[PDB]
Amino acid sequence: ITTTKPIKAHFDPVADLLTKINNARKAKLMTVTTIASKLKIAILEILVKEGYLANFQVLENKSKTKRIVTFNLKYTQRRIPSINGVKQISKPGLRIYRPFEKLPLVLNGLGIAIISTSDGVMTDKVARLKKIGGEILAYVW
């Protein structure tokens, strides 16, 4: 394959992802590329499984030399994205964390927040069930 339009360090992976997501929502665009990270891979896999986001492909040049991820949004056959709003939570200027018992259901009890904890990254419901809390990466609904 050929993954085009690489992005360098903007100021962080989270805002680099958010700007691409909102630009894809704006221009009705299908697939966009951003930086690669263990947290980004975890949240992207969990969003593929959650249904808000479509698949993704993580690519490398040879090593840490360049690691990116291309990601597509799930679209019905009407150019309607499955993403109805995603908000980044983990930020450089503000490191946000919440306990397992203080995680809400987004949308109307439907939206799923992505939460990394002391021992892994998971969804809000199973984060509450795990009895282990930590940082929040993205509120997705």
């Binding site: 992207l44 896999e45 698949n55 993704f56 690519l59 019905t76 009407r78 150019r79």
Partner: peptide, 23 residues
């Protein structure tokens, strides 16, 4: 250069389609 193809399927060709049966 391919590292991992998480569900390599990608949606494409969103035709203008709605209420396909009206007869």
């Amino acid at each position: 250069r391919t590292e991992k193809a998480q569900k390599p399927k990608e949606e494409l060709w969103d035709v203008v389609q709605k209420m396909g049966n009206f007869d």
